[PDB]
Write a protein that binds this DNA or RNA. Structure first.
Ligand SMILES: [Mg+2]
Ligand SMILES: [Mg+2]
Ligand SMILES: [Mg+2]
Ligand SMILES: [Mg+2]
Lengths: 81, 354, 52, 111, 143, 93, 18
RNA sequence: ACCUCGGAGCAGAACCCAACCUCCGAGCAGUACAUGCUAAGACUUCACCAGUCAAAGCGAACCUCAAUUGAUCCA
């Protein structure tokens, strides 16, 4: 009885897997594109600047990125209700 | 303690001064061409070419054949310049070349290859397969006249024997359709032998087909001094090589001491040797054509062993040497538990005196 | 800095294998060969057992 | 008073195990090394740790052949393109000239 | 006792093509750090001069078996611009035909990366495969 | 003798005669042998199980042949490129 | 080897000055 | 002051060789999760314990580094 139960559980887990496989790979592609989108966001706002390194330009870019992130969260909160 | 070299050191000819005014290898394939050029030279140190079985090749090999027909290379070169100039005149050829769409008439280049440079290629294929090594004990030649032998099985197609092809013995059931060019003053000896397939003798070979004094292109008119017999490679043995030979003789020479009885189904009689047979007829004839093909077992070979040869069919098998184990130690230190199973004969339980 | 985590299999149950992992990242989900089903199935990170 | 400390590591016993002419069965280790000294030739493979082991039963022969690197091996490719237009490299190679034929055809059944 | 039945219990086959047609002949394994690898029974080798293109098929002992080169008048008269891509495509077609007539239809092609990404070698490999000659020689048996 | 073996039915006797021709003697005997054990009981049992499995396998001609590619892929490509050389218009027998 | 006639056959850095 | 491991010199061309001799380092890190399973022949830090390479085979796509480490019992 417990052998049958184990083999039946293995059969059900094996049937339920290919959909888990494709869901996991789609989520892999999604977070990959999200990470690279964050890379291009951190690359866009540092463009406009004067001198020299990221002692001021990168902190201003991070401040504007924090403003944009808070704006996105506020847009989500307004969209909710 | 040193010892001086026995000759020139390899990178010594270049000068170590003025290095920046030397030309470097700007690429990888330039160095590759130079290195594979250099690896062919006879160096004085120890090399790969000395050890790995190159048969000690430098020794000139005897030619036994027809001479090359004399051509005037100046006229030929100017006419070929005329031809490629006439082809270069067309502009649709330039459009086809630029537009990546321009094929070749493969049958025309096939017949032209048979016409001009094909004999040398067939010579090196015949030397690769070891035909000149086993037919004339090393003596080589060129198949000067082209030859076309085609086999007959069904209704429409063909199965030709080109140089080195593979034809099954079912497709070699009957005599093939042999054709070639010849004048009406020449006599020919056809000869078909299998370089492998002799069972009792390692270095002999089986004569399957011999026609003598072929009057030119009349291949039917020759006297059947040995009747046609299909090939018979055994089962477990590998690929067997049959080879046709076409000789041109000056004067009509006859021989009955090599002739066979009309069935000729006793295998001791078909014990042939092309070296001795060419030794007997060394002066009257000269080899002019050559064709040969691979042959492996099919289910008609047991028919050949049954109703023609009247024997039981021998089968073979490709065995390997038994595996190597050291001398068995009494106390095998740190060997796994399966060490005892490498030296056991039967994997069944044994009970000595009980 | 790193951490050694146990991954458990989904199909062909009971099979586990351990692997290192960065600490600050999220938990793992991998493809691994499960020999009781003789295939590549999903594994899910569960019950970290080290701090290396 | 002995500021230096640490160099007490023992010798690795690396070197040639089979010289030229020694009969070698398949899988015998021919030479252990780090930082490639003898390069593998015909019927000789390499391990992860650059040891040389036979792949056939035969007799070891040491030769000196021209060295042509793999095209993706980028450091050796730039060392090749830095040579002048006549130089070639000649590293040392280890071969195993195999002794036994890989099989024979026996007569099993006469049916 | 029938006199036809002397079989001499070990059969000797002297065909050099034999054991590599039974897929049991040993390939020269190794060399493992240099290029090209010596693990083949036959190789495809193409030589690209600034004037002509020539393709060879070699055995690993070194003796060539078949070749198709634009220096030959047969291929020379039927095409234009022996250097260009369609000449190499013609060389591939003619070599595939010539080696099917030679009974050799397994060979290895081992190029540099920039040659394998070239259009000429791509169309030559395509002409070889569409001619019926397949690359990627089979495995040795009990390797 | 496989031809006059009356205890086996005719179509499966023909199917065994076709697909096991490599074990059929000159006189039509079907030669089976064994070398596994060192007691002749187990060798005889292995021979009889070979006969049983051959009979019960040949009668089920819906047996699905699973594709292998190590030893017959060579012969497949050789037969294909042997068929590529068939191009004439007239030949007989 | 150092005592053989082929000593220094694999010398290369006397060709590259860089 | 030191107690374990690795590289160079002493120890110049198979192996090995000490010093409270001279100099560097290490107690990690990084990427795949087949870093799956079995199996000829070997090397071995001068013993043992430990450590290292690996043909072929079943399956499946078509590993960097030098040291980077800890036996038994017991939990
Ligand atoms: Mg030391
Ligand atoms: Mg010491
Ligand atoms: Mg020891
Ligand atoms: Mg393996």
């Amino acid at each position: 009885q417990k052998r049958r139960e184990r083999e039946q559980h293995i059969a059900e887990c094996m049937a339920k897997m290919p959909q888990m496989i494709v869901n996991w790979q789609q989520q892999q592609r999604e977070n990959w594109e999200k990470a690279q989108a964050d890379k291009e966001r951190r690359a866009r706002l540092q463009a406009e600047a004067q001198e020299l390194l990221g002692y001021q330009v990168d902190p201003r870019s991070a401040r504007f990125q924090e403003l944009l992130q808070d704006l996105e969260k506020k847009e989500r909160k307004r969209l909710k209700e | 303690r040193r010892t001086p070299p026995l000759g020139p050191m390899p990178n010594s000819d270049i000068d170590l001064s003025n290095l920046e005014r030397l030309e470097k290898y700007r690429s990888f394939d330039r160095y590759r061409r130079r290195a594979e050029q250099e690896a062919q030279a006879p160096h004085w140190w120890r090399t790969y070419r000395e050890y790995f079985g190159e048969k000690t090749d430098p020794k000139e090999k005897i030619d036994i054949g027809l001479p090359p027909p004399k051509v005037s290379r100046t006229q030929q070169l100017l006419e070929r310049k005329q031809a490629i100039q006439e082809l270069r005149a067309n502009v649709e050829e330039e459009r086809a070349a630029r537009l990546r769409t321009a094929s070749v008439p493969l049958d025309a280049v096939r017949a032209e290859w048979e016409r001009t440079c094909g004999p040398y290629h067939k010579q090196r294929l015949a030397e690769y397969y070891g035909l000149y090594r086993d037919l004339f004990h090393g003596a080589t030649f060129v198949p000067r006249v082209p030859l076309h032998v085609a086999y007959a099985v069904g209704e429409d197609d063909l199965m030709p024997v080109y140089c080195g092809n593979e034809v099954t013995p079912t497709e070699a059931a009957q005599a093939p359709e042999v054709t070639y060019e010849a004048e009406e003053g020449s006599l020919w000896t056809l000869l078909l032998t299998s370089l492998d397939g002799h069972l009792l003798e390692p270095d002999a070979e089986y004569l399957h087909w011999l026609l003598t004094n072929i009057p030119g292109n009349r291949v039917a008119e020759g006297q059947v001094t040995c009747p046609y017999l299909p090939p018979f490679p055994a089962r477990g043995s590998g690929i067997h090589r049959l080879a046709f030979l076409l000789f041109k003789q000056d004067q009509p020479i006859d021989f009955s001491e090599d002739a066979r009885p009309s069935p000729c189904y006793q295998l001791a009689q078909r014990t042939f040797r092309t070296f001795d047979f060419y030794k007997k007829h060394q002066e009257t004839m000269t080899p002019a054509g050559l064709s040969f093909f691979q042959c492996r077992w099919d289910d008609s070979v047991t028919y050949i062993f049954h109703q023609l040869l009247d024997m039981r069919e021998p089968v073979f098998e490709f065995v390997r040497p038994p595996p190597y184990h050291p001398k068995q130690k009494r106390f095998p230190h740190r060997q796994p538990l399966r060490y005892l199973d490498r030296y056991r004969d039967s994997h069944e339980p044994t009970y000595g005196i009980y | 800095k790193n951490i050694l985590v146990r991954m458990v299999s989904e199909a062909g149950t009971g099979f586990c294998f351990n692997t290192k992992r960065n600490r600050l990242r999220e938990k793992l989900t991998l493809l691994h060969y499960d020999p009781v089903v003789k295939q590549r199935v999903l594994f899910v990170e569960k019950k970290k057992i080290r701090s290396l | 008073s002995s500021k230096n400390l640490g160099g007490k590591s023992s010798g690795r016993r690396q070197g040639i195990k089979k010289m030229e002419g020694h009969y070698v069965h398949a899988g015998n280790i021919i030479a252990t090394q780090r930082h490639f000294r003898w390069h593998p030739g015909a019927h000789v493979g390499v391990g992860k740790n650059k040891c040389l082991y036979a792949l056939e039963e035969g007799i070891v022969r040491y030769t000196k052949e021209v060295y042509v690197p793999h095209p993706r091996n980028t450091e050796a490719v730039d060392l090749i393109t830095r040579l002048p237009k006549g130089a070639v490299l000649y590293k040392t190679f280890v071969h195993v000239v195999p002794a036994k034929p890989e099989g024979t055809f026996k007569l099993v059944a006469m049916l | 006792p029938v006199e036809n039945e002397a079989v001499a219990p070990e059969f000797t086959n002297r065909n050099p093509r034999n054991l590599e047609l039974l897929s049991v002949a040993r390939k020269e394994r190794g060399w493992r750090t240099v290029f090209p690898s010596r693990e083949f029974w036959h190789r495809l080798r193409v030589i690209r001069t600034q004037h002509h293109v020539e393709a060879l098929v070699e055995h690993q002992n070194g003796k060539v078996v078949v070749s198709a080169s634009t220096r030959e008048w047969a291929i020379k008269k039927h095409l234009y611009s022996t250097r260009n891509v369609v000449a190499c495509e013609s060389i591939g077609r003619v070599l595939a035909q010539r080696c099917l007539e030679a009974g050799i239809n397994f060979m290895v092609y081992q190029p540099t990366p920039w040659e394998a990404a070239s259009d000429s070698m791509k169309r030559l490999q395509s002409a070889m495969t569409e001619g019926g000659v397949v690359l990627r020689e089979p495995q040795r048996i009990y390797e | 003798h496989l031809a006059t073996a009356e205890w086996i039915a005719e179509p499966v006797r023909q199917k065994i005669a076709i697909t096991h021709k490599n074990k059929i003697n000159r006189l039509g005997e079907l030669i089976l042998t064994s070398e596994s054990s060192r007691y002749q009981f187990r060798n005889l049992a292995d021979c009889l199980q070979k006969i049983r499995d051959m009979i019960t396998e040949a009668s089920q001609t819906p047996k699905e042949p699973t594709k292998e590619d190590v030893k017959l892929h060579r012969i497949r490509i050789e037969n294909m490129n042997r068929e590529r050389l068939r191009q004439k218009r007239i030949h007989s027998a | 080897y150092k005592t053989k006639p082929t000593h220094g056959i694999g010398k290369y850095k006397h060709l590259i000055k860089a």
